[PDB]
């Protein structure tokens, strides 16, 4: 019956492979350091997403030699939670961060074990001031951080999720073939200055400056933050963002991702190659080049082997499900079906898409699908009915 799921997930998979969701790092020779750019998604409580576009620069505090890396990225897995015995406004954070993006230093020695962390933030967003203190520990062997933060000035005037990126990338796990690309540990113990501008789409921006360095045996991140131009009714000052992660995979969701994986993995060997990916995308009426295919795989290719293996696919789909897609992204998916751009998916346009995915399909399982999605009753699927089908 409902294989709006199978094809829904394949659309989600291709959308993910066509997007840039990681933390992209590049050398900045003029500053003897690095710069980064990335996009963060903050789910909006009532539906929708609030995008936050980050630009970042890091410069070493010391004069010692540092590693200036080839282009690569960090991939972050975050989980936010609450301490049931904590009365104060607070956030508990657990993060695993790994570098990738490149295919197959003295300061790094400071990170072979568990290192205590302290974080201190003083903030001012549209004149609303606040401070946060955090403490915990990092275990870079696994890319792992555990921290608890408290708003020490009372009530935090912005949502906790918007501060996560600001509140120690020296704890990232760099794989063995990428150790010469880890600028962050190479700058230790004297540390680095990290600066960002963060643009919240349709809203204001944060500007941050931080000093990250060892003070005795503790890695300390001391930050100032200034936010301007926020809407007093927007998602940030109006506190409309979801807090809790949404990290639960109902095992049959995993079975669903497996079914989607098999659309790509047509030889059944448990990994997707460029040839397989290209075969799927041509069937959907696209024509990416070999280089575009390699770049798409590289975006999720944790091990650098040039293919997406089943666990790498599960990891990418888990993250795609955790965060809401923007209207622009959903419209792009909708355009895949709405081939004539009239704003309506007809049973003919729908036939075409699935029948190209290899869905041996006839003529009433098709219409049973239209029926499922067809809420107003006009015999077609419009954008708003489509949005729901992608949920």
Instruction: Note whether 372 binds Ca ion by CB under 5 A.
Output: no
Q: Is 327 marked within a binding site? A: no
Show contacts with Ca ion in window 121-180 (CB under 5 A).
Answer: none
Q: Is 344 marked within a binding site? A: yes
Instruction: Note whether 364 binds Ca ion by CB under 5 A.
Output: no
Q: Which stretch binds Ca ion (CB under 5 A): 33-41, 229-237, 326-334, 339-347?
A: 339-347
Instruction: Note whether 305 binds Ca ion by CB under 5 A.
Output: yes
For residues 197 and 205, the answer to whether their CB atoms sit within 8 Å is: yes
Q: Determine the Cα angle at 303 with ends 290 and 219, to 5°.
A: 125
Q: What whole-number distance in Å separates Cα of residue 249 and Cα of residue 246?
A: 9
Instruction: Note whether 299 binds Ca ion by CB under 5 A.
Output: no
Q: Is 295 marked within a binding site? A: no
The DSSP-derived string for 129-178 is: EEEEEEEEEEETTTTEEEEEEEETTSS-SS-GGGGTTT--GGG-B--GGG
Q: What whole-number distance in Å separates Cα of residue 100 and Cα of residue 327?
A: 29
Least Cβ distance, residue 344 to Ca ion (angstroms) = 5
Show contacts with Ca ion in window 270-289 (CB under 5 A).
Answer: none
Contacts of 52 (CB under 8 A, 6+ apart): 39, 40, 41, 42, 162, 165, 198, 199, 200, 201
Instruction: Note whether 267 binds Ca ion by CB under 5 A.
Output: yes
Least Cβ distance, residue 97 to Ca ion (angstroms) = 18
Q: Is 338 marked within a binding site? A: yes
Instruction: Note whether 384 binds Ca ion by CB under 5 A.
Output: no
Closest CA to 260 of 33, 78, 15: 15
C-alpha distances in Å from residue 134, one per residue of 118, 151, 184, 197, 245: 6, 9, 20, 22, 19
For residues 329 and 318, the answer to whether their CB atoms sit within 8 Å is: no
Known binding residues are 265, 267, 269, 271, 273, 276, 301, 303, 305, 307, 312, 338, 340, 342, 344, 349, 374, 376, 378, 380, 385
Known binding residues for Ca(2+) are 265, 267, 269, 271, 273, 276, 301, 303, 305, 307, 312, 338, 340, 342, 344, 349, 374, 376, 378, 380, 385
Which residues bind to Ca ion, rule: CB under 5 A? Answer: 265, 267, 269, 301, 303, 305, 307, 309, 338, 340, 342, 344, 374, 376, 378
């Amino acid at each position: 019956r409902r294989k709006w799921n199978k094809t829904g997930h394949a659309v989600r998979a291709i959308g993910r492979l066509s997007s840039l969701e990681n933390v992209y790092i590049k050398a900045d020779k003029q500053k003897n350091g690095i710069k980064a750019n990335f996009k963060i998604r903050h789910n909006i409580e009532d539906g929708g997403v609030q995008l936050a576009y980050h630009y970042q620069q890091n410069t070493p505090i010391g004069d010692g030699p540092v590693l200036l890396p080839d282009n690569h990225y960090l991939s972050v897995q975050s989980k936010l939670s609450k301490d049931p015995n904590e009365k104060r406004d607070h956030m508990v954070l657990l993060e695993f961060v790994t570098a990738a993006g490149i295919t197959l230093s003295k300061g790094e020695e400071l990170f072979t074990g568990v290192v205590p962390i302290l974080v201190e933030l003083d903030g001012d967003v549209n004149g609303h001031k606040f401070s946060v203190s955090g403490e915990g520990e990092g275990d870079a062997t696994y890319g792992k951080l555990t921290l608890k933060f408290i708003c020490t000035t009372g009530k935090l005037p912005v949502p906790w999720p918007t501060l996560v990126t600001t509140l120690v990338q020296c704890f990232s796990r760099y794989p063995d073939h990428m150790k010469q690309h880890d600028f962050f540990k190479s700058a230790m113990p004297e540390g680095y200055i990290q600066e960002r501008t963060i643009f919240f789409k349709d809203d204001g921006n944060y500007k941050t400056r931080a000093e990250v360095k060892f003070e005795g045996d503790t890695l300390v991140n001391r930050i100032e933050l200034k936010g301007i131009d926020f809407k007093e009714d927007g998602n940030i000052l109006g506190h409309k963002l979801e807090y809790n992660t949404r990290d639960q995979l109902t095992e049959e969701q995993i079975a669903e991702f497996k079914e989607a994986f098999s659309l790509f993995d047509k030889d059944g060997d448990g990994t997707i190659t460029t040839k397989e990916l290209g075969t799927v995308m041509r069937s959907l009426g696209q024509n990416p080049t070999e280089a575009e295919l390699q770049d798409m795989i590289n975006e999720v290719d944790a091990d650098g082997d040039g293919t997406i293996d089943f666990p790498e696919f599960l990891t990418m789909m888990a993250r795609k499900m955790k965060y809401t897609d923007s209207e622009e992204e959903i419209r792009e998916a909708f355009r895949v079906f709405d081939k004539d751009g009239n704003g309506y998916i007809s049973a003919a346009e729908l036939r075409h898409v699935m029948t190209n995915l290899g869905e041996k399909l006839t003529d009433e399982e098709v219409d049973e699908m239209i029926r499922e999605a067809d809420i107003d009753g006009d015999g077609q699927v419009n954008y708003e009915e489509f949005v729901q089908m992608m949920t």
